[PDB]
Amino acid sequence: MQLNITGNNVEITEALREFVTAKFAKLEQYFDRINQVYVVLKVEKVTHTSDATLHVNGGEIHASAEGQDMYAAIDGLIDKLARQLTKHKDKLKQH
């Protein structure tokens, strides 16, 4: 269960990185299919872009989200990502 992040054209402050990990953590409670995760967020005067990639036993999901800010990108990115994790998580726990 190891996760890492990479910021392109953005200063990675303990608070920022924490926010990202904070969301994933809350997901680590119900979601047990997370071993290696890599996230990247670009910050430009135009639009902010963020990408997420979660790993699962036998399968791997890769999605990306954009937001008005580095915070919004993570919100929608971790939102759609979670809902996706639950979908595939339903296949496993079949009882």
mmCIF file of C-alpha atoms in Angstrom:
data_model
loop_
_atom_site.group_PDB
_atom_site.id
_atom_site.type_symbol
_atom_site.label_atom_id
_atom_site.label_comp_id
_atom_site.label_asym_id
_atom_site.label_seq_id
_atom_site.Cartn_x
_atom_site.Cartn_y
_atom_site.Cartn_z
ATOM 1 C CA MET A 1 0.000 0.000 0.000
ATOM 2 C CA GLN A 2 2.343 2.717 -1.272
ATOM 3 C CA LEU A 3 1.230 5.890 -3.053
ATOM 4 C CA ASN A 4 3.232 8.681 -4.690
ATOM 5 C CA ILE A 5 2.542 12.027 -6.368
ATOM 6 C CA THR A 6 4.317 14.199 -8.935
ATOM 7 C CA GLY A 7 3.610 17.879 -9.490
ATOM 8 C CA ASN A 8 4.484 19.489 -12.816
ATOM 9 C CA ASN A 9 4.920 23.269 -12.713
ATOM 10 C CA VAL A 10 3.581 23.371 -9.156
ATOM 11 C CA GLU A 11 5.168 23.658 -5.709
ATOM 12 C CA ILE A 12 4.405 20.543 -3.663
ATOM 13 C CA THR A 13 3.677 21.883 -0.178
ATOM 14 C CA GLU A 14 3.178 19.516 2.775
ATOM 15 C CA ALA A 15 -0.407 20.795 2.868
ATOM 16 C CA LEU A 16 -1.083 20.095 -0.809
ATOM 17 C CA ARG A 17 0.332 16.563 -0.962
ATOM 18 C CA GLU A 18 -1.493 15.919 2.314
ATOM 19 C CA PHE A 19 -4.840 16.910 0.794
ATOM 20 C CA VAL A 20 -4.409 14.352 -1.986
ATOM 21 C CA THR A 21 -3.332 11.582 0.385
ATOM 22 C CA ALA A 22 -6.103 12.661 2.755
ATOM 23 C CA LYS A 23 -8.764 11.713 0.210
ATOM 24 C CA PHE A 24 -7.127 8.416 -0.747
ATOM 25 C CA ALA A 25 -6.802 7.558 2.945
ATOM 26 C CA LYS A 26 -10.534 7.973 3.569
ATOM 27 C CA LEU A 27 -10.983 5.617 0.615
ATOM 28 C CA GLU A 28 -8.521 3.119 2.088
ATOM 29 C CA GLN A 29 -11.240 2.362 4.654
ATOM 30 C CA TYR A 30 -13.750 0.755 2.284
ATOM 31 C CA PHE A 31 -11.406 0.330 -0.688
ATOM 32 C CA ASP A 32 -8.813 -2.408 -0.174
ATOM 33 C CA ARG A 33 -7.717 -2.569 -3.821
ATOM 34 C CA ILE A 34 -4.999 0.083 -3.623
ATOM 35 C CA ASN A 35 -1.307 -0.837 -3.697
ATOM 36 C CA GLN A 36 0.435 1.576 -6.068
ATOM 37 C CA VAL A 37 -1.126 4.931 -6.940
ATOM 38 C CA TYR A 38 0.397 7.781 -8.943
ATOM 39 C CA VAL A 39 -1.177 11.217 -9.318
ATOM 40 C CA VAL A 40 -0.048 14.276 -11.273
ATOM 41 C CA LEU A 41 -1.428 17.794 -11.394
ATOM 42 C CA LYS A 42 -0.369 20.607 -13.725
ATOM 43 C CA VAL A 43 -0.896 24.268 -12.850
ATOM 44 C CA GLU A 44 -1.058 26.785 -15.691
ATOM 45 C CA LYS A 45 -2.506 30.291 -16.003
ATOM 46 C CA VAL A 46 -5.088 28.717 -18.327
ATOM 47 C CA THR A 47 -6.587 25.507 -16.902
ATOM 48 C CA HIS A 48 -5.596 23.023 -14.193
ATOM 49 C CA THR A 49 -5.179 19.349 -15.097
ATOM 50 C CA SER A 50 -4.948 16.315 -12.813
ATOM 51 C CA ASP A 51 -4.526 12.588 -13.455
ATOM 52 C CA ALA A 52 -5.101 9.517 -11.279
ATOM 53 C CA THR A 53 -4.011 5.895 -11.681
ATOM 54 C CA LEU A 54 -5.067 3.191 -9.220
ATOM 55 C CA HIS A 55 -3.793 -0.395 -9.229
ATOM 56 C CA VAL A 56 -5.918 -3.469 -8.524
ATOM 57 C CA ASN A 57 -5.298 -7.216 -8.302
ATOM 58 C CA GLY A 58 -5.632 -8.320 -11.915
ATOM 59 C CA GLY A 59 -6.801 -4.923 -13.116
ATOM 60 C CA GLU A 60 -5.713 -1.287 -13.216
ATOM 61 C CA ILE A 61 -7.819 1.856 -13.618
ATOM 62 C CA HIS A 62 -6.537 5.051 -15.236
ATOM 63 C CA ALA A 63 -8.567 8.266 -15.155
ATOM 64 C CA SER A 64 -7.986 12.023 -15.249
ATOM 65 C CA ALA A 65 -9.914 15.092 -14.100
ATOM 66 C CA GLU A 66 -9.748 18.857 -14.594
ATOM 67 C CA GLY A 67 -10.762 21.684 -12.283
ATOM 68 C CA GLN A 68 -10.797 25.461 -11.919
ATOM 69 C CA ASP A 69 -7.976 24.973 -9.400
ATOM 70 C CA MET A 70 -5.521 22.404 -8.037
ATOM 71 C CA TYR A 71 -8.147 21.663 -5.379
ATOM 72 C CA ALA A 72 -11.082 21.214 -7.754
ATOM 73 C CA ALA A 73 -9.123 18.846 -9.997
ATOM 74 C CA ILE A 74 -8.549 16.519 -7.043
ATOM 75 C CA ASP A 75 -12.188 16.792 -5.968
ATOM 76 C CA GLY A 76 -13.649 15.610 -9.260
ATOM 77 C CA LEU A 77 -10.715 13.268 -9.827
ATOM 78 C CA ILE A 78 -11.146 11.498 -6.491
ATOM 79 C CA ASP A 79 -14.926 11.618 -6.916
ATOM 80 C CA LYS A 80 -15.243 9.747 -10.209
ATOM 81 C CA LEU A 81 -12.300 7.537 -9.248
ATOM 82 C CA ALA A 82 -13.954 6.373 -6.024
ATOM 83 C CA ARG A 83 -17.308 5.578 -7.646
ATOM 84 C CA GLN A 84 -15.322 3.519 -10.157
ATOM 85 C CA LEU A 85 -13.459 1.631 -7.439
ATOM 86 C CA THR A 86 -16.743 0.658 -5.790
ATOM 87 C CA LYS A 87 -18.118 -0.631 -9.096
ATOM 88 C CA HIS A 88 -15.285 -3.126 -9.581
ATOM 89 C CA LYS A 89 -15.198 -3.751 -5.822
ATOM 90 C CA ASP A 90 -18.727 -5.167 -6.051
ATOM 91 C CA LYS A 91 -17.519 -7.982 -8.312
ATOM 92 C CA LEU A 92 -15.102 -9.260 -5.672
ATOM 93 C CA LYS A 93 -17.269 -9.219 -2.546
ATOM 94 C CA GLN A 94 -20.074 -11.425 -3.865
ATOM 95 C CA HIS A 95 -21.897 -12.808 -0.828
#
